Amino acid sequence: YNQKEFVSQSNCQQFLNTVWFGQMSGYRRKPTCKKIMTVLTVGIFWPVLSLCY
Amino acid sequence: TMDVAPVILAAHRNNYEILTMLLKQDVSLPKPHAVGCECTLCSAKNKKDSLRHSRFRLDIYRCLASPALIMLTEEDPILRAFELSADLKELSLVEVEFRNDYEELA
Amino acid sequence: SMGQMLQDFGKFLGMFLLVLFSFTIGLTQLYDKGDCVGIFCEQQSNDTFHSFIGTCFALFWYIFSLAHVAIFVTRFSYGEELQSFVGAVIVGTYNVVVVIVLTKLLVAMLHKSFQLIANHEDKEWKFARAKLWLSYFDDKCTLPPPFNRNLKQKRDENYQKVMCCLVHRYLTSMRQKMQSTDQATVENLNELRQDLSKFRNEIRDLL
Amino acid sequence: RDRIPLRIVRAESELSPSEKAYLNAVEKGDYASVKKSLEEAEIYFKININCIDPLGRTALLIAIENENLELIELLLSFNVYVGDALLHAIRKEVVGAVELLLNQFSEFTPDITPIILAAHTNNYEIIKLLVQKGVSVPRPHEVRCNCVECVSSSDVDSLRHSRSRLNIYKALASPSLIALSSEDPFLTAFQLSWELQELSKVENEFKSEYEELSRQCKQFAKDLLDQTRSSRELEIILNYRDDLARLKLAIKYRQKEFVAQPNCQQLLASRWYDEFPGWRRRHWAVKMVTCFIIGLLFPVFSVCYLIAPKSPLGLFIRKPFIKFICHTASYLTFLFLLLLASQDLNRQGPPPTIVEWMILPWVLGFIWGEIKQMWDGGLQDYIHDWWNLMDFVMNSLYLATISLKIVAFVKRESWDMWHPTLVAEALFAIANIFSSLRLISLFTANSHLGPLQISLGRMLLDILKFLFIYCLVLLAFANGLNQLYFYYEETKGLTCKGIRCEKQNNAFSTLFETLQSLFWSIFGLINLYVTNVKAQHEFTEFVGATMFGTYNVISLVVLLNMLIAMMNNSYQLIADHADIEWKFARTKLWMSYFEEGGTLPTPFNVRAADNLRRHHQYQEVMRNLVKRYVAAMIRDAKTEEGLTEENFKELKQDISSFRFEVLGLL
Amino acid sequence: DRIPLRIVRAESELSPSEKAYLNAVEKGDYASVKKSLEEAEIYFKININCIDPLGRTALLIAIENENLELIELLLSFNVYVGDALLHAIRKEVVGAVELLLNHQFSEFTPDITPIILAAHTNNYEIIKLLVQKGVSVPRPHEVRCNCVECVSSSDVDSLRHSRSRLNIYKALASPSLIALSSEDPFLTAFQLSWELQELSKVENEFKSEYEELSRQCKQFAKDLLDQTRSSRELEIILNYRDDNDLARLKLAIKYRQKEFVAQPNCQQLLASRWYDEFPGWRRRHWAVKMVTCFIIGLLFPVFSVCYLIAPKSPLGLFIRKPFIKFICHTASYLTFLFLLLLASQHIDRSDLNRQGPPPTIVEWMILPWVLGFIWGEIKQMWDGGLQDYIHDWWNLMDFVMNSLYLATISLKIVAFVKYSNPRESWDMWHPTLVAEALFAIANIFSSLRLISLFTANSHLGPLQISLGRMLLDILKFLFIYCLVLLAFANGLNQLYFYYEETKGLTCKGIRCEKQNNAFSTLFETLQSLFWSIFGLINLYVTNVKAQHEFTEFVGATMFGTYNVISLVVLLNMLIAMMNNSYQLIADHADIEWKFARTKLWMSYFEEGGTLPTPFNVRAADNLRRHHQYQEVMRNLVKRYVAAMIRDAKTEEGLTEENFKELKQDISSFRFEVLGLL
Ligand SMILES: Cn1c(=O)n(CCCO)c(=O)c2c1nc(Oc1cccc(OC(F)(F)F)c1)n2Cc1ccc(Cl)cc1
Ligand SMILES: Cn1c(=O)n(CCCO)c(=O)c2c1nc(Oc1cccc(OC(F)(F)F)c1)n2Cc1ccc(Cl)cc1
Ligand SMILES: Cn1c(=O)n(CCCO)c(=O)c2c1nc(Oc1cccc(OC(F)(F)F)c1)n2Cc1ccc(Cl)cc1
Ligand SMILES: [Ca+2]
Ligand SMILES: [Ca+2]
Ligand SMILES: [Zn+2]
Ligand SMILES: [Zn+2]
Ligand SMILES: [Zn+2]
């Protein structure tokens, strides 16, 4: 229904953050360098994760 | 204006107390027509008095868009707010003459 | 913000197409009678304005004002002075009504537009990000491209309890904000003068 | 001395301590002490009744700013010095001025009578009381008046005369006085707005005040249109005439606030889409398909109404939307003819019947349409619209092309450059350019491109105002380059002279080539070696190079970005309210196509009792309108208003007077 | 038909006696409410705890309508108090002491205690009373902590935990609590602003509240400095240390308190310290200022050697003035740039030598200055830490320039010791050519350091600062440009690279007399599409030497489309975005320039680094300082709370609550009079 104010609310966005980050809710707690190398090290071995799923 | 009922004006001033005493008296507003309704009545009211019909529709959709009337008489106020915002945006697309008012109510 | 901004460009290019179409018509009417062929070679020559699509091609590259089309394309091969000069005046008028006028008008329009979007910018970005997130929230297709009832009544009752609580809290917050935000007007002063005068008249009547 | 001594150089009047106690008790709103003070003032005492503070606060004036009706009645009872305190009661906006009506320096101008200040304060009850007492305002002179007495008064005191005229025009432009005293407040608002605009044009000083007054009058007219609540009332107002004659008057007087009214636009959209419902409700592709099939079938509806006017196909041209669609279909057909005309080898051309013979009458129909426009409006209406000027130069070029073709008929690589065939072809090309640029004026009908075109049209003036300064800079640098570079004018061995060659040379030899080269230097189309002479004089080459550089700096870096900044500010000021301007232009287009004349496109056009009834109907409906309007401004003025210091002073002084009255009673 | 309106949320409308009770309560009549309570002692339909569906009680209305006698009367009659104390604190009513000592849809978060709401309301008297009674606030955890309690509360109730943390930090960041309970409100304000900035960066939700809280703490510190009225108070504030130092000023510069440093009094003290021993340097004609700056710039080596010989000398102490020290450092850098500019021009030798021997003209004079730069950058890496080094982009460019100079020196001595013939016969990767190019890039990096020297000037320092601000947004948009460039470059390469030709031509690539093989490889395509923004790529690069007209047309169409994008869409978007960015940062340009100029000033304030770049190669005192700081800062806190209360009485604001307050008061007075008379 294109509700811009409903979804930009802090509570709704926070719930979306907790659903989006999944198990590692401390990914936001990690520093930016650690987030970068975590994103990289998932980006390398992605076919392994897809095949193992 | 002559087309304004007391409950429509009560929703216009958006007071919760006036609403919660007025709807105790079994009050129902007229149902506005669709986005492109051109039935035997709707094609005749535009012929009869276009400005009066447009002001009546604007008054009804300002009465329904008040938060007090949404929060009092509906099963789900969030769903009513969603549907009313979508309907008001569609009417502002259709009604070129009152784009600011319908956009403000949305 | 750029994705919201693209509609302004749509309108501006809608006007620019008509301006370009006018001059292309004028130039290909003026230069119609008078190896490499066309404009895409070293010696650009007068063959740019011979064809209609060639004239649109030549007038397409003039908008950057960076020597994309050299001005010796406006010189007749037959050496007629007045037709060549009128063609030069026409392409100069094109380079005035665009580049100098239309492009800077576009810059002003974009300046006002980006002043307008920038206030509702974070909300729009969060909405689009949430749209992408809910597109990726499904269990419908988890693999990458290469691999590629009383319970309803109980839920409605729980939702009714939560929504009744929310309606109560929002009513209290709305009346709190309303009583803490509005400013006193002259009519409230008039009610206060009325209460004072009613005091004075009741005092005079009683005494 | 290291200390600045302070003293009152203008000591003014001083008061006795008893007089100060009298004034302070009046400020407190006291019954007993003030009454006793005036009672001892009746007998020979120090206390004078007409005590004036050095702040110009007499007890009369203080009680006026005190608003206590009992106190002001007490002061008028024993005959205090009534000076300008009536005007103070007018300024304070209190209905208690009727008591003064029933009964040294001045803070106001000597011209200010009570009615002028009442109209300035814009209180309906006060102006009603003043005109019920019987009051005539002074007559202002005309906007281009010629009076010997008024000229002599200007020679005596020009300042007082200009302030007098400004005060009179501010009194007349008040909405309450217009609604209370004028026969036709819409006509009065229109004429007063036009008079104030011409007065601001004539008086370059005090221009902001007159522009504010004119905008206030236009806002009053728009509000009086807001108060309507029926299409019958709109049809009474807009069709009133002493045909939408009042809407024609609003168009002529440039009332963009009146014209862009949502109710007026509702009536205009109803009249434009004559018996054509659901056009906006239907799909965009569907409505463009209907527009395309009406415009494609244009000759069958335009042949009708020429032979059978009462036929339904003949009456299909009666609808103004169909008329506009037929006209634009005719114009795209004319441009299609021009396109095929663009797409032999004779000294004089026989008339090319295949595509270039049916253009001749269509141009003749265009000339007849412009002549009909010339008859309807005179010379100022035609020169007022820039598009009529563009049409005039287009038809002039087409007529010159026809005349040159005829001259060639009665009289390549061999003809003189002044052959009528070549000049005729060039004039036809420029006329084609103008005729195809004519399409950009049809964007006012569209909603997406309308405000765009109108904003461009009214920023063209700022563009020209910048281009004048650019012209001066261009002329200066071209004169310098001419003086420097004209001793090296090459004459031998040049296969091509000028900047328009494969090898650029002789760029700055003459003035005309210098103007062309400095124009083309903006777009980077003039190479750097045009400043290198054949000789060895490297100093003059360097001076020419640095002169070219400085020009390029001034044009590209400085003046072009200054134009960008000026366009930014101008487009901000224009797109603040460009929607009303766009709706005004669209109404002008619609009402130009509402007329019974010009129903044929340019292809095929080559009683006292009734007046009394209309007057009474308009009068009754506008009594209703002014009643609603005064109710609305009374309601609005009662809310969203700051109380400020005066309301607190009144409210605190009422409690003080109440406390003193209670202490007197008990 | 008609829309039916049935009230879904069913609330009891109570007894008419209860409505009369409520009406007597807001209406202000003391007699009717007392009579109603006496009637309510017999336990008929009126109840003392009647709750009105709007969400008000008689006690709650009495709280909202002041009249402390009414709350005393109701509290004497056992009215239920669930959150009436909390509504009293929210109402900013000082009559909450009656609820303090005498006697879920709660319209409040369950986290909120009285002290949290008291600090939220920012009322000095209420917070003072609550702390005097004895109340404490729960301690928030670290901004980045993985302790068991935080993650457990997040898994149980994430929204409740986040709102609780936000309310705790909003209570701690109140100016009144900080001014009343924190022992060091300057350090507390600095640390709280820093912690709230880290919370805004980490928690992307609730970011606006966190940056508003940080701005409020910076506002509090600025106002606290604005309440000073003497020079000794400023000196004892700025020189205070935890354990001429300006330690608090260093710590405030570290914590990025912009408006703290840009305060006029701190600027006055720093300008007094900057022009040390100067009889009105600013009170001078600008021509005299120019010539005197020229003559201190010229006599830089004599002051340098005077400091090296005799530190106690007046000329040896002349360099210790920070302004003269800055002038001499700028003179050293300008002489370095002049030496490089002579190195470009004085060189007139064969320039053919195979190894390029180091001349005595400019080399061995550039070399020391280069290693003095290296030693200075090593010292600034050690002193102040690595984070302060990488915070400034200017130090990063200085490190890059020093690395390039070291690489040039290494390549030159490698060419001296190895591979020691016409110039055209040299390989493209010869060590001397690499040394030449690296020296050139180091020179274009060294001659841009004068822009960093421009923060001291008043006329253009804010301009340079604003350009430094929006350079980040420039890079922000250049990322999008890089994406467009990669897209169109690899598309055009995928089109034209089947048509690669050599033909034994003299030059290949775009940088020839006639452009050829522009879109041949990916590197050449990226270079050719980059240069097309500036119009230096002609239109004859799009056609192929063969007669494949369709591929030529679609290549010219792709090239024209990219030109349309990167020359109409993206560049004008960049102009509009720059317009809005400079409109936003025009107001904050002055405080940013003052902060940057004070950082540059305090770079030269330290004892170390006095020599320029040629020559770079107790408890009782603590208790006395603590007591002086405590008494001065107590005076500051008292002045600030007095000024804040006075401004609270000064702000032009009157809600509809106060008109209702006056109406209820005058009605109560009238009803008392009618009861008596
Ligand atoms: C349209 N046009 C043109 O086509 N040519 C080329 C003719 C053959 O080369 C021109 O030389 C040419 C031209 N308008 C020209 O004056 C301008 C005035 C104001 C603005 C402007 O616009 C902009 F600010 F520059 F952007 C241009 N000049 C220069 C000129 C030439 C002759 C004379 Cl008498 C006076 C002035
Ligand atoms: C006007 N002018 C010029 O004509 N020439 C061409 C001369 C013959 O080629 C130049 O080279 C030239 C020039 N102004 C120049 O410095 C500018 C300074 C600041 C702004 C500016 O403006 C803009 F930002 F660039 F727009 C230009 N320079 C560069 C220069 C050349 C030699 C020397 Cl010693 C010093 C500076
Ligand atoms: C993308 N594109 C392009 O690549 N070429 C080069 C092709 C080989 O030369 C063109 O000539 C070309 C082109 N778009 C063109 O119309 C525009 C549409 C939208 C924007 C625009 O520009 C701006 F944004 F307003 F500035 C220009 N034209 C001109 C044209 C040519 C032939 C015909 Cl039938 C119709 C139009
Ligand atoms: Ca016309
Ligand atoms: Ca450094
Ligand atoms: Zn219907
Ligand atoms: Zn006169
Ligand atoms: Zn923790």
Cβ proximity of E75 and E96 under 8 Å:
no
- With the C-alpha atoms ordered E210, E211, E214, E216, is the resulting torsion angle positive or negative? negative
d(CA D23, CA B88): 62
Residue D553 Cβ inside 6 Å of ligand 2? The answer reads yes
Task: Please tell me the distance in Å from E318's CA to the nearest CA on chain C.
Answer: 52
Q: What atom of ligand 1 comes closest to residue C92's alpha carbon?
A: 4
Three-class secondary structure assignment of chain C = CHHHHHHHHHHHHHHHHHHHHHHHHHHHHHCCCCCCCCCCCCCCCHHHHCCHHHHHHHHHCCCCCCCCCCHHHHCCCCCCHHHHHHHHHHHHHHHHHHHHHHHHHHHHHHHHHHHHHCCCCHHHHHHHHHHHHHHCCCCCCCCCCCCCCHHHHHHHHHHHHHHHHHHHHHHHHHHHHHHHHCECCHHHHHHHHHHHHHHHHHHHHHC
Q: Given the structure tokens 């279909």, which residue do they identify?
A: D329
Length of chain C: 207
Resolution for this experimental structure (Å): 3.4
What value, to the nearest 5°, has the Cα angle with vertex A2 and ends E484 and B57? Answer: 135
Q: Which residues of C touch D433 (CB under 8 A)?
A: 22-23, 25-26, 90
Q: How many CA atoms, within 13 angstroms, populate the side-chain half-sphere of residue E65?
A: 26
Residue in B44, B62, B45 with CA at minimum distance from that of residue B98: B62
C-beta atoms surrounding E503 within 10 Å = 8
Choose, out of A2, A4, A7, the residue to mutate when testing the contact with B (most B CBs < 10 Å).
A2
All residues of chain C having their beta carbon less than 8 Å from the beta carbon of residue E663 are 191-192, 195
The bound ligand whose nearest atom lies closest to the alpha carbon of E164 is: 8
Closest listed residue to residue D209, CA positions, set D253, D145, D172, D166? D166
Residue E429's Cβ-side half-sphere holds a number of Cα atoms within 13 Å equal to 0
Distance between E566 CA and the closest CA of chain C, angstroms: 11
C-beta of residue D652 within 8 angstroms of C-beta of residue D205: no
Q: Does D568 touch chain E (CB under 8 A)?
A: yes
The amino acid at E390? I
Report the 3 state secondary structure along E259-281. HHHCCHHHHHHHHHHHCCCCCCC
Q: What would the two tokens of residue B98 be?
A: 């009152």
* Residue E572, ligand 3, Cβ within 6 A: no
Binding site annotation covers D373?
A: yes
Task: Write D605-613 long-range contacts (CB < 8 A, 24+).
Answer: D605/D365, D605/D368, D605/D369, D606/D361, D606/D364, D606/D365, D606/D368, D611/D242
Contact E653/C176 with Cβ under 8 angstroms?
no
Cβ contacts of E205 on chain A, cutoff 8 Å: 10, 13-14, 17
Place of tokens 């044929």: D600
Contact of D572 with chain E, judged by CB distance below 8 Å, is answered with no
Which of E573, E661, E671 to substitute to test the interface with C, most C CBs within 10 Å?
E573
User: What is the count of residue pairs from A and B with beta carbons less than 8 Å apart?
Assistant: 8
The number of the ligand 2 atom at minimal distance from the alpha carbon of D553 is 26
Q: Is A17 on the interface with E (CB under 8 A)?
A: yes
C-beta of residue E302 within 8 angstroms of C-beta of residue E315: yes
CB E168, CB E137: distance < 8 Å? yes
CB of residue C9 inside a 6 A radius of ligand 3: no
Alpha-carbon distance of E415 to E129, in angstroms, equals: 80
CB D185 within 8 A of CB D210: no
φ, ψ (nearest 5 deg) of residue D505: -155, 160
For ligand 1, pick from D465, D512, D519 the residue to mutate: most ligand atoms within 8 Å of CB.
Answer: D519
Cα B94 to middle of ligand 6, angstroms: 15
Alpha helices in chain B, H assignment, sequence order: 6-13, 16-22, 42-48, 50-64, 67-72, 77-94, 99-105
Largest CA-CA distance found in chain A, in angstroms, rounded = 40
Q: Of D1, D2, D51, whose CA–CA distance to D22 is shortest?
A: D51
Q: What are residue E4's phi and psi, to 5 degrees?
A: -75, 145
CA–CA separation, C118 and E571 (whole Å)? 18
Query: Which amino acid belongs to residue C184?
Result: A
DSSP SS3 for E184: coil
Strand partners, D52: D58
Task: Nearest chain C residue to D458 by CA: give it.
Answer: C105
Find out whether D19 and D51 touch, Cβ atoms under 8 Å: yes
Rounded distance from Cα E148 to ligand 8 centre (Å)? 7
| CA distance, residue E471 to nearest chain D CA (Å) | 20
The secondary structure of E503-553 as a DSSP string is TT-S--BSSSSS-BSTTSSHHHHHHHHHHGGGT-S-GGGSS-SS--HHHHH
For residue D534, give the DSSP letter: S
CB nearest to B77's CB, from C167, C174, C175: C167
Residue type at E636 in one-letter notation: L
> For residue D394, which ligand has an atom nearest its CA?
4
Q: Which two tokens stand for residue E73?
A: 């009367």
CA distance D549 to D556: 10
Identify which of D477, D546, D550 to mutate to test ligand 2's pocket (most ligand atoms within 8 A of the CB). D546
**Chain A residues in contact with C144 (beta carbon < 8 A):** 46, 50
Q: Note whether A touches D: 3 CB pairs or more under 8 A.
A: no
Non-local (6+) Cβ contacts of E556 within 8 A are: C40, E539, E542, E543
- Check: CB of residue C57 under 8 Å from CB of residue C37: no
CB of E447 within 8 A of CB of E340?
Answer: yes
Q: Which residues of E touch C176 (CB under 8 A)?
A: 107
Asked whether the beta carbons of residue C192 and residue E666 sit closer than 8 angstroms, the reply is yes
- Which one, of E168, E66, E65, E188, lies nearest residue E117 by Cα? E168
Whether D103 and D82 have beta carbons less than 8 Å apart is answered as yes
What is the Å distance from ligand 1's center to C116 Cα?
36
Number of residues that make up chain E: 677
Structure tokens at D650: 């009144």
Tracing tokens 């929060």 back to the chain, one arrives at B71
- Which burial class, exposed, middle or buried, applies to E208 when counting CB atoms under 10 A from its CB (0-12, 13-18, 19+)? exposed
- The radius of gyration of chain B from alpha carbons, rounded to an integer in Å, stands at 14
Nearest-CA distance B76 → chain C (Å): 8
Side chain identity, residue C39: I
Q: Can you tell me which residue has the tokens 């397409």? A: C60
How many CB atoms are located within 10 Å of the residue D140 CB? 17
E514–C206 C-beta distance less than 8 A: no
Contacts 24+ apart (CB under 8 A), E326-331: E326/E456, E326/E604, E327/E293, E327/E296, E327/E297, E327/E300, E328/E296, E328/E297, E328/E300, E328/E303, E328/E304, E328/E612, E329/E604, E329/E612, E329/E613, E330/E297, E330/E453, E331/E296, E331/E297, E331/E298, E331/E300
Do the chains contact at D449 and C11, CB–CB below 8 Å? yes
Q: Please tell me the number of the ligand nearest to residue D555's CA.
A: 1
Residue C100 in contact with ligand 1 by CB distance below 6 A: yes
**What distance in angstroms lies between residue E389's CA and the mean position of ligand 5's atoms?**
8
Burial E622-655 (b: 16+ CB within 10 A, else e): eeeeeeebeebbeebbebbbeebeeeeeeeeeee
SS (H, E, C) D88-153: HHHHHCCCCHHHHHHCCCCCCCCCCCHHHHHHHHCCHHHHHHHHHHCCCCCCCCCCCCCCHHHHHH
Q: Kindly list the partner chains of chain D, i.e. chains with 3 or more CB atom pairs below 8 Å.
A: B, C, E
Query: Ligand 2 atom closest to Cα of D545?
Result: 8
What whole-number distance in Å separates Cα of residue E265 and Cα of residue E249?
13
Please tell me the distance between residue B60's alpha carbon and the centre of ligand 6 in angstroms: 15
Q: Which ligand 2 atom minimizes the distance to the CA of D546? A: 4
Place of tokens 């075109």: D453
| Among D292, D300, D375, residue whose Cα is nearest residue D595 | D375
Q: Check the annotation: does D141 bind a ligand.
A: yes
Nearest to C41 among E540, E569, E583 (CB): E540
What are D16's two structure tokens?
């006795």
How many residues in chain B? 106
Q: Does any ligand 2 atom lie closer than 6 A to the CB of residue D545?
A: yes
Taking CA atoms only, the protein residue closest to ligand 2 atom 20 is: D553
User: Which tokens is C165 given?
Assistant: 């609580």
Closest CA to E419 of E357, E350, E351, E343: E357
Helix (H) or strand (E) segment spanning residue E2: strand E2-3
Please return the burial class of D79, using the count of CB atoms within 10 Å of its CB with bins 0-12, 13-18 and 19+: exposed
Distance between CA atoms of residues D583 and D247, nearest Å:
14
Tokens coding D15: 């008061």
Please answer whether residues D544 and D517 qualify as being in contact, where contact means their C-beta atoms are separated by less than 8 angstroms: no
Residue nearest to atom 1 of ligand 3 (CA): E561
Contact E432, E412 (CB under 8 A): yes
E207-226 and E619-648 helices cross at what angle (nearest 10)? Answer: 110
Both tokens of E42, joined, read: 């017999």
Beta bridge partners of D498: D505
Cα–Cα distance between E137 and E126 in angstroms, integer? Answer: 15
- Residue minimizing CA distance to atom 26 of ligand 1: C96
DSSP 8-state code for residue E426: S
Euclidean distance between CA atoms E580 and C110, whole angstroms: 10
DSSP annotation string for E329-350:
HHHHHHHHHHHHHHHHHT--S-
**Whose CA is closest to E490, among E532, E452, E450, E523?**
E523
